[PDB]
Amino acid sequence: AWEMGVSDPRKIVFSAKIGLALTIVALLIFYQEPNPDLSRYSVWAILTVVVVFEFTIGATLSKGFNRALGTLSAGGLALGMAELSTLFGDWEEIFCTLSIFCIGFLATFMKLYPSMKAYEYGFRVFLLTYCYILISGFRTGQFIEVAISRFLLIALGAGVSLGVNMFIYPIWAGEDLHNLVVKNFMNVATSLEGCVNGYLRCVYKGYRSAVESTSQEESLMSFAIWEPPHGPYKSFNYPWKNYVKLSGALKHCAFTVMALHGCILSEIQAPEERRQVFRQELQRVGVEGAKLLRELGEKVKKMEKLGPVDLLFEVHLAAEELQHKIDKKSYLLVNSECWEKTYESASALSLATFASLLIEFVARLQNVVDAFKELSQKANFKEPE
């Protein structure tokens, strides 16, 4: 709807590009095509623009390379079999049908594999080009004319699809990984405070996005290694994998926020009066952790190094004060009368469970800090100063 466009004008630009490219093709065929032969197979160029035009440059480049490899191999095999069939005269069809059967079975078995999956389009292109080349030419003997004619009419369509995408308003794939890495930190920082406030009162997406985005970052890293140097990224081998390593380090910490949110939604709960004895320490720990995560996200957004001061001092001190307070009032968690109702005991122990989970969350931050240091060192970030 209009709202979606206004919010994301980029998509409108992509649609405009698609339309300008199809218009260019259509005009080049409506006017500048005097040769009659092309007319016979001139509807082959305006159908290579609707399949190779992708959102990013890297995706377009890699998928086009795969499709061209598939098409070339299929054409070569088809022509070879066509030439070899003539040996057995009067039995041509009884050979070409067995060939189409063996090749359909093979090109259908290898795709169903998990390793070779995620590359179906190439197998489909191979099977379609083999069937087309075998059936089309047949006895007429034009097994090579058709091939070179169509390859050379597809090439023009793919060139017109690539030039317009690359030279109007490029949408690079290496900046979406940077922006998703930036966004995850803020999502987790919001989730932690949301959970703490929800537990202390008288989130969902925040941790799902961090815990459920590895595949998107792996696809964006597969597309980002194909793009040439541009803008802030000038090295010839940008360490795109340290972003994934930092994302994993952050997901390992977000699993504890997921466990705390699941602790909020439990069947057995504790009396509010008991929870209101530890409010200050929990709120301090939550504020400190949110501040640390937001500072790390801000330093990742601006491509800057860490300063001299230690960032984990205050959160460590807050967690130590929390531990001291828990140690001072431990008589509200266990039953001291008997020492040699189940619901009451579970309610008593749910508070120690919550505190232990918060302490584990505070203890899992050093790995994220180390991963950030490694990324800022291999990626040549600038001095904060």
Ligand X SMILES: CCCCCCCCCCCCCCCC(=O)O
Ligand Y SMILES: CCCCCCCCCCCCCCCCCC(=O)O
Residue 379 lies near a copy of itself (rule: CB under 8 A): no
Write the binding mask 60 to 99 for a copy of itself: x where contact by CB under 8 A, - elsewhere: ---------------------------------x--xxx-
Question: Among positive and negative, which fits the CA dihedral 97, 98, 104, 107?
Answer: negative
Residue nearer to ligand X on the CB measure, 154 or 282: 154
Backbone angles phi, psi at 313, to 5 degrees: -65, -50
CA distance 135 to 280: 78
Helix (H) / strand (E) element for 203: namely none
Residue 125 lies near ligand CCCCCCCCCC (rule: CB under 6 A): yes
Q: Which of 25, 29, 147, 292 binds ligand X (CB under 6 A)?
A: 147
SS3 305: coil
Residues numbered 120-159 forming contacts with ligand Y, rule: CB under 6 A: 125, 128-129, 132, 147, 150-151
Shortest reach from residue 27's CB to ligand X, in Å: 20
CB 221 within 8 A of CB 177: yes
Residue nearer to a copy of itself on the CB measure, 37 or 320: 320
What are the residues whose beta carbons fall under 8 Å from the beta carbon of 72, sequence distance 6 or more? Answer: none
Residue 369 lies near a copy of itself (rule: CB under 8 A): no
Written in H, E and C, the secondary structure of 164-199 is: HHHHCCCCCCHHHHHHHHHHHHHHHHHHHHHHHHHH
CA distance 95 to 88: 9
Residue type, 317: L
DSSP assignment string, 336-367: -S----HHHHHHHHHHHHHHHHHHHHHHTHHH
| From 121-129, 240-248, 278-286, 348-356, span contacting ligand X (CB under 6 A) | 121-129
Residues numbered 34-63 forming contacts with ligand CCCCCCCCCC, rule: CB under 6 A: 48, 51
328, two tokens: 């001072």
Shortest reach from residue 141's CB to ligand X, in Å: 14
CB 235 within 8 A of CB 229: yes
CA distance 102 to 94: 13
Residue 15 lies near a copy of itself (rule: CB under 8 A): yes
| Of residues 133, 161, 147, 142, the one with CA closest to residue 47 | 161
Residue 192 lies near a copy of itself (rule: CB under 8 A): no
CB atoms within 10 A of CB 356: 11
Residues numbered 20-59 forming contacts with a copy of itself, rule: CB under 8 A: 20, 22-23, 26-27, 29-31, 40, 42-43, 46-47, 50-51
Residue nearer to a copy of itself on the CB measure, 127 or 160: 127
Judged by beta carbon distances under 5 to 8 A according to partner kind, the member of ligand Y, a copy of itself, ligand X, none in contact with residue 338 is a copy of itself
CB 306 within 8 A of CB 300: no
Residue 154 lies near ligand CCCCCCCCCC (rule: CB under 6 A): yes
Shortest reach from residue 116's CB to ligand Y, in Å: 17
Contact residues: ligand CCCCCCCCCC, CB under 6 A: 48, 51, 64, 67-68, 71, 125, 154-155, 158
| Contacting positions for ligand X (CB under 6 A) | 47-48, 51-52, 64, 67-68, 71-72, 75-76, 79, 125, 128-129, 132-133, 144, 147-148, 150-151, 154-155, 158
